[PDB]
Every structure is written in structure tokens, then in C-alpha cells.
């Protein structure tokens, strides 16, 4: 029952000095060993520091590590914060033949340039129609800021059921991209005159129109 | 005014922060006037500190 | 040096047997009396070790993961392998294999992680459906198009345009669950509107988990 | 407020907006060296712990 208390999000500015504490429960922490671990978002884990004070060849000289044991709780330091030390830190224990890891360190980064929100639309497919099933696909993308509402309409009743929307997600260019889509029914598709998608963006809207052709 | 503030030595608002002078100056140093020339009529600004 | 990598399906249905094997490259599994062990971590979760095995029969596991884990060691293929029984939708995680210089102390190397996130068993292949562009999907000198991907199980599904000989413009957008498990996305390109009706677009949509690859060819709407 | 010249009496407010010597060298409100002010930014943002 022997677990590693963790500060979940630790923040501060490039430059200065934080500390990050690793707090036993029951056993004490200068009981066993204690691992630090620097591992990159979509990266394998990389040892960043053992045995409590022995640092390995490679990583810097500022990744120094202290044991308070009247505590309980191990303490990471860390100087002069760079761009590159943006990753989780994991502690890691033994306690008895069962090896437990920390909570987990989170370390906080830190705005794109506005654009203009250009919106398409595309009518379901003749191969989709075939299938019995109708999607109306709206998209909205190379835009800033992402915050954009989607309201689907059918001719002038906006449509609620079966419509999904994407969050916004960066581009290439510094910009935003987002989808939307709406199932239908092939009868449904093909009952109203028009299907429109309007798409809201920092007051003004870019509607586009498709009608069954 | 500020001649007399570049000398190895001193504490001020111009050597301490542009050019400080170690003790161990061995450096010469030489000006004159040229009021006719480094300044002109309306508000000569171009220098900045 | 040495180096890990791992192999295995990189799913699993529910309630049955997990296979991850994970070899080994420029070392011995015997040799230097070394430890393996199998590390786990979910997205966004911190890291769960999982057990450790030796390369005789000593093992250990973790009591949460107790009479759950069967790992083996063969060491004629330099290799070992781990099997889960009994998986969950809460066992998506990323599996690692590393090497264990010192048991109760640091790792030296980590394998690379082959993320497996999987909660059911729907494993439906990906409808490619064609975004003809017309006179309406278009904003002034350029046009957009593209193709529908939806009703697929499960993540994730590589598109491509001309097999990957367009890449500018092409934006591919990540999938939202639907109103009935299953998920939906596309993936679009910006193209003027003078090489409409003169180039052929044909998008590449695989779906590894369902072993489908459909190509579909966009085309100019024609009205009906 | 993160700098001052000494102690305060308690039920007292502190509104002096003058640079302190928290560093070595002098400060009084001139310029001098490491003069930090007492007066910083926070960090407040809603996505912390």
C-alpha cells in the first residue's frame, strides 16, 4: 500500500529555480531508491537522474536531486529552466519486490495570428446514396481564433440530430482547421429544397449553400 | 559634464552602465570639442544612451 | 549498444489473451545478469509498471496486475514476451520493454512504445465516400475536395492523396465519436479550380486494424 | 508585495512604490544594481492545479 505523492502541475518561468517533491505514504523514502524520469510527449522515458544525487552522462549538471527522509518526500531541483525540459517527471520506488511510480509532474508552456475563416461544402454522394445513408461534410478551416460554433440548416429549421463537429486543431500555417457532419437519411436528404451550413466566427458568418442535384 | 565620470574608479549613471573601467586600466584616453559639427539648430537627437 | 523493439498485434478485444513480444538487437537475454521488465502507460495517466521477469523462471508481479500477467522467456530467439488475460476497456496504455541493469533501482534503455488503446470489438472497415466539389465548394481562385471516412472502428486510419505525392494543402482532421459507437472523419486538399476537370485526385484511405484499403478517385459533381 | 526594508506593524497597509536593495548594492530608489522591485506580476492562469 506503499505509493508516491506527486505535485500533478508545476509551473515557473525559464531561468529561475523550482523543485519538485516525490512524498511517500507509508514507508519512508530513504528506505529505497529513488528515479527521477524525463520523458517527451509521444517519446519513450529517459532516466534523468538515480541513486538519489548521482546524475548519468549526458543530461546537465542542473538536474540535481535531494532525500528529506524526516519528510518522507524526495526532492528534484532544477535551475535555469529551458525550452527542452518541458516534460513529465515520474519518481520511481521498490518497496518490496513490487515497483511503484510516481503521480506525475506536468510543467505548464507558456497565440496564433487571426485569419479568415473559409468554410466548404460538399453534398452526399451518388455511392452513398446508393448505400441508403446521406452526409452532409461542412469545413471550416486556415482560421484564428478557434472558437467557431456550427449551426446545420435545412432550408430555413436548423438541425440538431445526427450533427457532429470536430474541435478546432492548429495547421501547417499557424492556423485552425475544423469539420462538421451531418447523417441523414437519403429521404431526408432529398425532402428539403436546400441544405445549408452557417458557421459563426468572432461575430461574423461565412454561409454556404447545397441543394440535392 | 560626464568627462569627468570615465576614469578607472568611479560610481555614476553613464560608466556603470555602458562601459565600466577596471582597476587594471591601462587604456588613454583623448576628446575635444566639436559643437560645430556632432550638433545643429532645432534639437539634435540622432545620439541615444 | 543494445536496443529494444517491440512486436505483437497492437490491439486486443475484450475479455481475451494479449500478445506483446519484445526482442532483442546487439545483447544476449542470458548473458550480464540483467533484469526485463514491462511497463505500462495510459494517455495522459502516469507510468504502471506492470512486472518483471528474470531469464529463468523468477517473476513478480503487481498486485493490482496479480494473477493476471504470464510472461515467458525463450532464449534461443533472444526475445521475451508478455500475455495479459482478461482485458478491459481500461487496460489502453502504452506498452514499453526495458532493460533492468539494477532491479530495485533506474532503467538504462527504454523500447519504444507501441501505444495499445482498444474498448471494443466492432472492428469495422472505413467507408470512403467522395466530396465532389462544384461551383458552391469553391471561395474565388480555389477550389476544395476531398473524401468522407466515416463509420470505422476502430483508431486510426492513414489517408493520403496520390499516394502521398500531395501533401500541400491537405489537412487531415482528427475523428469524434458518432451518435452510435463508431467514429468519422476526412480529409480535404485546396486546389485551384483550373486543374478540376484535368487532374485526377484519388485519395488513400487504410485502415490497418480492419486490413482495408479503399482508393477512391474525386471527381466534379454531375448533375442529375 | 515580495521586498522590503524591515519588519511592518501588523493592521498596517504598504503602498510605497519605490525600488528596494534586495540585492548587495544600493537601492533607494535609484537605479543602481540588482534592483529588483517589490512589486511583481502573478501567475494566475485557469488551467493550473
Known amino acids: 500500500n506503499f505509493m508516491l505523492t506527486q505535485p500533478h502541475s508545476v509551473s515557473e518561468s525559464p531561468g529561475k529555480t523550482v523543485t519538485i517533491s516525490c512524498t511517500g505514504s507509508?514507508?519512508?523514502?530513504?528506505?529505497?531508491?529513488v528515479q527521477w524520469y524525463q520523458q517527451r510527449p509521444g517519446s519513450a522515458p529517459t532516466t534523468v537522474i538515480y541513486?538519489?544525487?548521482?546524475?548519468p552522462s549526458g543530461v546537465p549538471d542542473r538536474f540535481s536531486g535531494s532525500i528529506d527522509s524526516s519528510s518522507n518526500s524526495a526532492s528534484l531541483t532544477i535551475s535555469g529552466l529551458k525550452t527542452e525540459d518541458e516534460a513529465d517527471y515520474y519518481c520511481?520506488?521498490?518497496?518490496?519486490?513490487?515497483?511503484?511510480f510516481g503521480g506525475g509532474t506536468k510543467l505548464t508552456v507558456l497565440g496564433q495570428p487571426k485569419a479568415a475563416p473559409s468554410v466548404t461544402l460538399f453534398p452526399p454522394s451518388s455511392e452513398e446514396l446508393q448505400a441508403n445513408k446521406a452526409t452532409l461534410v461542412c469545413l471550416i478551416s486556415d482560421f484564428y481564433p478557434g472558437a467557431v460554433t456550427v449551426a446545420w440548416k435545412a432550408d430555413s429549421s436548423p438541425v440538431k440530430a445526427g450533427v457532429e463537429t470536430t474541435t478546432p486543431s492548429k495547421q501547417s500555417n499557424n492556423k485552425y482547421a475544423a469539420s462538421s457532419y451531418l447523417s441523414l437519411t437519403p429521404e431526408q436528404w432529398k425532402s428539403h429544397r436546400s441544405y445549408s451550413c452557417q458557421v459563426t466566427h468572432e461575430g461574423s458568418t461565412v454561409e454556404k449553400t447545397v441543394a440535392p442535384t | 559634464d560626464e568627462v569627468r565620470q570615465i576614469a578607472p574608479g568611479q560610481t555614476g549613471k553613464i560608466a556603470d552602465y555602458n562601459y565600466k573601467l577596471p582597476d587594471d586600466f591601462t587604456g588613454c584616453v583623448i576628446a575635444w570639442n566639436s559643437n560645430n559639427l556632432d550638433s545643429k539648430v532645432g534639437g539634435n537627437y540622432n545620439y541615444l544612451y | 549498444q543494445v536496443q529494444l523493439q517491440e512486436s505483437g498485434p497492437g490491439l486486443v478485444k475484450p475479455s481475451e489473451t494479449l500478445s506483446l513480444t519484445c526482442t532483442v538487437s546487439?545483447?544476449?537475454?542470458?548473458?550480464?545478469?540483467?533484469?526485463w521488465s514491462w511497463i505500462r502507460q495510459p494517455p495522459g495517466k502516469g507510468l504502471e509498471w506492470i512486472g518483471c521477469?528474470?531469464?529463468?523462471?523468477?517473476?513478480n508481479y503487481n498486485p493490482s496486475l496479480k494473477s493476471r500477467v504470464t510472461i515467458s522467456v525463450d532464449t534461443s530467439k533472444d526475445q521475451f514476451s508478455l500475455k495479459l488475460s482478461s482485458v478491459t476497456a481500461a487496460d489502453t496504455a502504452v506498452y514499453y520493454c526495458?532493460?533492468?541493469?539494477?532491479?530495485?533501482?533506474?532503467?538504462?534503455?527504454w523500447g519504444q512504445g507501441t501505444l495499445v488503446t482498444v474498448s471494443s470489438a466492432s472492428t469495422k472497415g472505413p467507408s470512403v465516400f467522395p466530396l465532389a466539389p462544384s461551383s458552391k465548394s469553391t471561395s474565388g481562385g480555389t477550389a476544395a475536395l476531398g473524401c468522407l471516412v466515416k463509420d470505422y472502428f476502430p483508431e486510426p486510419v492513414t489517408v493520403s492523396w496520390n499516394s502521398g505525392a500531395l501533401t500541400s494543402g491537405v489537412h487531415t482532421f482528427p475523428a469524434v465519436l458518432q451518435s452510435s459507437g463508431l467514429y468519422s472523419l476526412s480529409s480535404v486538399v485546396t486546389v485551384p479550380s483550373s486543374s478540376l476537370g484535368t487532374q485526377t485526385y484519388i485519395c488513400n484511405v487504410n485502415h490497418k486494424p480492419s486490413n482495408t484499403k479503399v482508393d477512391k478517385k474525386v471527381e466534379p459533381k454531375s448533375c442529375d | 508585495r515580495l521586498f522590503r526594508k524591515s519588519n511592518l506593524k501588523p493592521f498596517e497597509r504598504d503602498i510605497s512604490t519605490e525600488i528596494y536593495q534586495a540585492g548587495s548594492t544600493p537601492c533607494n530608489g535609484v537605479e543602481g544594481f540588482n534592483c529588483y522591485f517589490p512589486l511583481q506580476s502573478y501567475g494566475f492562469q485557469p488551467t493550473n492545479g
Open positions: 526495458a532493460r533492468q541493469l539494477w532491479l530495485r533501482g533506474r532503467f538504462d534503455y
Open positions: 520511481q520506488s521498490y518497496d518490496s519486490s513490487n515497483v511503484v
Open positions: 507509508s514507508g519512508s523514502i530513504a528506505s529505497n531508491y
Open positions: 546487439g545483447g544476449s537475454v542470458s548473458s550480464g545478469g540483467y533484469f
Open positions: 541513486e538519489d544525487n548521482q546524475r
Open positions: 521477469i528474470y531469464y529463468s523462471g523468477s517473476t
